[PDB]
Structure 1
């Protein structure tokens, strides 16, 4: 079904919380019988004729998206006596990539990481064809369908590109540390398919570091910009980036992987590679690891 009756959505537990709004695990159980399917339901804690307009669009977007590497949309639920709208998506028990990479830091080898990279690239190439920008690409936003299959989640920050432009100016930031975004995003609030690419490079980094805290983007960068005094991090970060400073090669990270990484971090958005050009490059490296 596409429209879920509010009263048949049995709350199970909390899946996650955001700066605003949240996602919880429920089970659609009209009988109470417990044979209803479990789903992932996001809802806003701040309903007003403004952020709802954003949520409305978010729902339409995910609904229009048809990719194996993008969290699947199930329906909506015009909630409890309304303006209490709720987004219903599939539920992926294995959780998000972030924790997965930590729980399985062992079993996971380069080819597998490349596989996830490849699949993420794919779901990203597709989004681009839909004139859409994710804005918040990160390992914490990637979910696991199965051992060899991941998907992109959280489209709460996504933006549809106006027909006449290849970029969007959004004052609202993403939810990850400033070290995940493109310079133009940080200095001029400009996001685009090319900015998604940059953040994709950070994801790559996260994968090959297995989302370790010691060598995470923040950790490496903070211990790299430690300088000036009392200078906002944002300002000192941009400065580092302008000087050619980029994240290092994660320990035991194949050389080639780090080179693609650096490519994604081209100061100029037009110098970064496209997802369609990245995909086959990764597929090579994957088939190169056997």
Structure 2
């Protein structure tokens, strides 16, 4: 089913919200008897020309990816007046990894966190082979399919690299989650697969702190930023990073995983390991742990 008849998408609730977009939980119920499959459905509201263009791109990217570790595209449906599309995807009832880690902390061991690390890395390896920069990778937009299975979601900011170039540049984002971004992204608006590796090291930090709010990247920054408190965060963060300061090793985090983090956060993009180099190292550590 490539086209989902709007009439059969039964609205249930909202799942989540960005500025320009929402995701809704719907049942696709073509028998009309409320027995059909749940789906997540994304649509724009309150968006300009660039946001609409960016959404058709989002759709095309997700539709082309077939990975166990990337949230699955199902189809499209029509929005109001059949003047717009909605992006129909599989529904993962366990929600985002960030919140799952906080709720289930007590029973998720290092081996399970290594499994999630390995799965995310594999997904990113898959993206990388399709010249896709995710950009937004964070625990808050990774989804839990089952207790032993996660998937990368939220392709709102994803972009394909041209055949002939290994990065792109944007106009200064008005607002971005600065504590996940590589320094070249913060300072020169450069994004690449290697800037995704930086963000992945911050994902490893998220995983091995169980996304505890007390040692969040923001909380660590405020601890680290120093005595001068009226200094703009982004300005101060870039200085800290330039000086070689990095998020600290979580108390419980295996030393080898911390070492991977530090490699991910190499100052020079070309000095960071690729996802294909990270994957076997994480796989080895996960294997070790079960």
Partner of 1:191: 191
Give the stretch that moved more between structures: 222-231 or 259-268: 222-231
Contact 2:134–2:157 (8 Å) recurs in 1 = yes
> How far 1:47 sits from its partner (Å)?
4.5
Give the stretch that moved more between structures: 49-58 or 272-281: 49-58
TM-score, structure 2 normalization: 0.96
Unaligned runs of 5+ in 2: none
> How far 1:78 sits from its partner (Å)?
2.0
Q: 1:174 to 1:268 in 2, by over 3 A?
A: farther
Contact 2:170–2:189 (8 Å) recurs in 1 = yes
Give the stretch that moved more between structures: 66-75 or 160-169: 160-169
Contact 2:71–2:90 (8 Å) recurs in 1 = yes
Higher helix share: 2
> How far 1:208 sits from its partner (Å)?
0.4
Q: 1:102 to 1:73 in 2, by over 3 A?
A: same
| Partner secondary structure for residue 213 of structure 2 | coil
> How far 1:55 sits from its partner (Å)?
0.5
Contact 1:157–1:174 (8 Å) recurs in 2 = no
> How far 1:174 sits from its partner (Å)?
9.7
> How far 1:6 sits from its partner (Å)?
1.2
Partner of 1:265: 265
Distance in 1, matches of 2:249 and 2:178, equals 19
Stretches of 4+ aligned residues off by more than 4 angstroms: 172-176
Distance in 1, matches of 2:48 and 2:136, equals 23
Contact 1:28–1:37 (8 Å) recurs in 2 = yes
Distance in 2, matches of 1:174 and 1:215, equals 26
Distance in 1, matches of 2:47 and 2:179, equals 30
2:45 is equivalent to residue 45 of structure 1: yes
Contact 2:20–2:51 (8 Å) recurs in 1 = no
Distance in 1, matches of 2:62 and 2:173, equals 20
| Partner secondary structure for residue 174 of structure 2 | coil
| Partner secondary structure for residue 165 of structure 1 | coil
Unaligned runs of 5+ in 1: none
> How far 1:49 sits from its partner (Å)?
3.5
Report how many aligned residue pairs link the two structures: 290
User: Cα RMSD (Å) of the superposition?
Assistant: 1.4
Distance in 1, matches of 2:211 and 2:195, equals 21
> How far 1:46 sits from its partner (Å)?
2.7
> How far 1:103 sits from its partner (Å)?
1.3
Give per-residue Cα distances to partners, 1:84-114, cap 9 Å, x unaligned. 3210000011111111111110110111100
> How far 1:227 sits from its partner (Å)?
3.6
> How far 1:252 sits from its partner (Å)?
1.2
Contact 1:25–1:41 (8 Å) recurs in 2 = yes
Contact 1:136–1:174 (8 Å) recurs in 2 = no
Distance in 2, matches of 1:127 and 1:174, equals 26
Contact 2:102–2:210 (8 Å) recurs in 1 = yes
Partner of 2:85: 85
> How far 1:7 sits from its partner (Å)?
1.8
| Partner secondary structure for residue 86 of structure 1 | strand
> How far 1:35 sits from its partner (Å)?
1.2
Give per-residue Cα distances to partners, 1:54-108, cap 9 Å, x unaligned. 1101101000001000000000012221323210000011111111111110110
Distance in 2, matches of 1:158 and 1:171, equals 15
Give per-residue Cα distances to partners, 1:189-235, cap 9 Å, x unaligned. 11000000000000000000001111011101121013435321111
2:273 is equivalent to residue 279 of structure 1: no
Contact 2:116–2:148 (8 Å) recurs in 1 = yes
> How far 1:169 sits from its partner (Å)?
0.8
> How far 1:117 sits from its partner (Å)?
0.2
Give per-residue Cα distances to partners, 1:263-285, cap 9 Å, x unaligned. 10000000000001100000111
Distance in 2, matches of 1:3 and 1:166, equals 34
